[PDB]
Amino acid sequence: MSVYPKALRDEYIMSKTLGSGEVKLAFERKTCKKVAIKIISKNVETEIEILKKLNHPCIIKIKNFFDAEDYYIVLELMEGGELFDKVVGNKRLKEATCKLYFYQMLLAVQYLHENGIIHRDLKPENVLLSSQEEDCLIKITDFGHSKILGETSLMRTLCGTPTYLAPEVLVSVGTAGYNRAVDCWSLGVILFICLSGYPPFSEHRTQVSLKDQITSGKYNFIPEVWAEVSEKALDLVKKLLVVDPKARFTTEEALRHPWLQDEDMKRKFQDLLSEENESTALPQVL
Amino acid sequence: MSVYPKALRDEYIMSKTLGSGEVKLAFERKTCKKVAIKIISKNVETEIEILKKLNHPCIIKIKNFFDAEDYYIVLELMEGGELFDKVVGNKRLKEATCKLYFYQMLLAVQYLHENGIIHRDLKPENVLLSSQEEDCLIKITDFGHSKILGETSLMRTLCGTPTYLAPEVLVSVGTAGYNRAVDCWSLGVILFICLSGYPPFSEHRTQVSLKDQITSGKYNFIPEVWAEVSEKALDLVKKLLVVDPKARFTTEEALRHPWLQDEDMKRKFQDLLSEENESTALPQVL
Numbered sequence: 001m002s003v004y005p006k007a008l009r010d011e012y013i014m015s016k017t018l019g020s021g022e023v024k025l026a027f028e029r030k031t032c033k034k035v036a037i038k039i040i041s042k043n044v045e046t047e048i049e050i051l052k053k054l055n056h057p058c059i060i061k062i063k064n065f066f067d068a069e070d071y072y073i074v075l076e077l078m079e080g081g082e083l084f085d086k087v088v089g090n091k092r093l094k095e096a097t098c099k100l101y102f103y104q105m106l107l108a109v110q111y112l113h114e115n116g117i118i119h120r121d122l123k124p125e126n127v128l129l130s131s132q133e134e135d136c137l138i139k140i141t142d143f144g145h146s147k148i149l150g151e152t153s154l155m156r157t158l159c160g161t162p163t164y165l166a167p168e169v170l171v172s173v174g175t176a177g178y179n180r181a182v183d184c185w186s187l188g189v190i191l192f193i194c195l196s197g198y199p200p201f202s203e204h205r206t207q208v209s210l211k212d213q214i215t216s217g218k219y220n221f222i223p224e225v226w227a228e229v230s231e232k233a234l235d236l237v238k239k240l241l242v243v244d245p246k247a248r249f250t251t252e253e254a255l256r257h258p259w260l261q262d263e264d265m266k267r268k269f270q271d272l273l274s275e276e277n278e279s280t281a282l283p284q285v286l
Numbered sequence: 287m288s289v290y291p292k293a294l295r296d297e298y299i300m301s302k303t304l305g306s307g308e309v310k311l312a313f314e315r316k317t318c319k320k321v322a323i324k325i326i327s328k329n330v331e332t333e334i335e336i337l338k339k340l341n342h343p344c345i346i347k348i349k350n351f352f353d354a355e356d357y358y359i360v361l362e363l364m365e366g367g368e369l370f371d372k373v374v375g376n377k378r379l380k381e382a383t384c385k386l387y388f389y390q391m392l393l394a395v396q397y398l399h400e401n402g403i404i405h406r407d408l409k410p411e412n413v414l415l416s417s418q419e420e421d422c423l424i425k426i427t428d429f430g431h432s433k434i435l436g437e438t439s440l441m442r443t444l445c446g447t448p449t450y451l452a453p454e455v456l457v458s459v460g461t462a463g464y465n466r467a468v469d470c471w472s473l474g475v476i477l478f479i480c481l482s483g484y485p486p487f488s489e490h491r492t493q494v495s496l497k498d499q500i501t502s503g504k505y506n507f508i509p510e511v512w513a514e515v516s517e518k519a520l521d522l523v524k525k526l527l528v529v530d531p532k533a534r535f536t537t538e539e540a541l542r543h544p545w546l547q548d549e550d551m552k553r554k555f556q557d558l559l560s561e562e563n564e565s566t567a568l569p570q571v572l
């Protein structure tokens with residue numbers, strides 16, 4: 001009881017659903033190559049604007065866009081699907097795999113912040129794996145909730161005498177420009193789930209409200225589970241799941257952390273990178 | 287070394303400067319009536335959008351707009367000029383006059399908030415008097431810094447499970463939707479200046495920083511000055527200059543305050559209103 005717009009249909013051959021909410025597999029007619037088409041029912045203009053400008057190997061790339069009776073966003077296909085499907089229902093990833101994926105999430109999020117973009121909705125369902133192999137490339141998706149940086153409204157206000165300026169505004173100055181720390185919290189919640197198989201904060205088998213657990217920063221620590229996990233890995237989690245956003249670890253601090261000082265891991269990612277990049281490598285000036 | 291655009295020039299005869307920063311007096315050709323033309327050098331689109339939709343006797347009305355090499359905003363002329371020029375350099379207004387003007391500022395700001403608009407830059411230089419008479423109509427101007435309401439970004443976020451939501455975001459929930467209280471602070475600083483002739487917070491003859499005076503909410507109280515002012519008037523000032531924005535008086539609470547329960551004042555404003563409105567009164571169905 002619905003059709004695809006003529007414009008989309010002219011360029012792509014639509015196929016099977018990859019993930020409803022919907023995301024469909026499609027074939028670009030010109031190349032005969034698999035693509036992914038994200039259908040948004042009728043903020044998307046901001047998302048396209050962000051996507052088009054951003055260029056990193058661990059951030060999803062926009063290939064095409066259709067503004068019809070619904071929104072159609074053509075993206076590169078990720079054959080591994082969602083990271084969520086690897087962690088769902090107490091399923092746990094090996095420490096090495098966690099590092100390989102985490103490192104990439106850190107590089108991706110560092111890039112975003114470097115470029116003044118805050119994702120705001122990082123989750124295992126927004127981290128996509130490139131292949132059905134455990135040693136693969138990851139890419140960050142869903143820039144729907146993303147925000148463009150600048151405390152510009154406060155900065156403009158501060159340029160004047162605060163004769164008439166309310167105290168709450170002068171108070172906010174202390175915290176202002178730490179909105180990006182929300183993404184480091186999120187990564188910290190992601191890293192906990194990956195390593196343990198379980199969430200740090202939940203309403204399962206507890207009296208304390210999800211709100212209170214988070215505000216206090218008192219995560220559920222199950223020793224039996226974490227015993228199979230290194231002290232370095234847990235130290236990093238502890239460093240990102242810090243209530244004070246000014247005290248919280250940045251992507252830079254996390255990347256400098258001992259847990260990430262792994263040359264084997266760094267080499268594997270570089271090998272996966274060159275493997276992807278080998279297909280489109282133009283001969284070069286020597 | 288500059289000219290007015292042909293489009294503006296086709297409709298208006300530009301005249302003398304009313305206030306630089308610039309604001310010029312002009313004559314609408316069709317009516318031979320005095321107008322005020324605000325020239326902004328190349329947010330104005332938001333300001334026009336707000337102005338066009340808002341309709342209250344104590345809020346400036348937009349008559350025309352020109353988007354040229356500069357921005358030109360045609361507004362109703364206010365022959366009394368800025369309220370700032372009545373309070374500048376220890377000059378003080380009589381209590382009755384303060385009430386008449388304050389009441390109108392409260393009605394104007396109530397309207398804004400009722401309609402989901404926060405002015406954000408209320409000052410005596412943004413309050414315009416209709417005539418050179420002390421008993422006159424006032425109108426609120428400069429919607430440049432104004433913001434359109436809705437905690438929509440937090441509201442959208444709260445619709446989900448906060449498994450991955452940062453604690454600072456859950457903390458902000460307590461305060462969220464009290465941004466309008468910034469305008470009540472501002473009015474409170476305005477009312478202090480009008481009644482006393484002096485500002486509540488300044489770096490003049492004091493050790494404590496302007497920031498600290500405001501954050502603490504410790505205004506400069508000079509008894510000798512305020513002795514000539516009623517306890518009701520000062521009680522209202524004390525009620526608006528409250529550090530906690532949740533505890534601070536709203537426009538509704540202020541309008542309900544004993545100081546404003548003045549039928550003589552309310553009658554005078556109504557008489558000034560009908561006097562302005564008499565010119566454009568269409569005969570009506572009886």
Ligand SMILES: Nc1cc(-c2cccnc2)n[nH]1
Binds near residue numbers: 018019075128
């Ligand atoms: N852009 C993109 C989305 C997807 C996907 C794959 C499987 C399930 N859900 C989403 N792949 N590539």
Ligand SMILES: Nc1cc(-c2cccnc2)n[nH]1
Binds near residue numbers: 309322362364366414
């Ligand atoms: N719209 C408007 C502005 C002004 C004005 C008058 C005098 C000084 N500064 C501004 N009258 N009416």
Ligand SMILES: [Cl-]
Binds near residue numbers: 002003004
């Ligand atoms: Cl179809």
Ligand SMILES: [Cl-]
Binds near residue numbers: 288289290
């Ligand atoms: Cl000219």
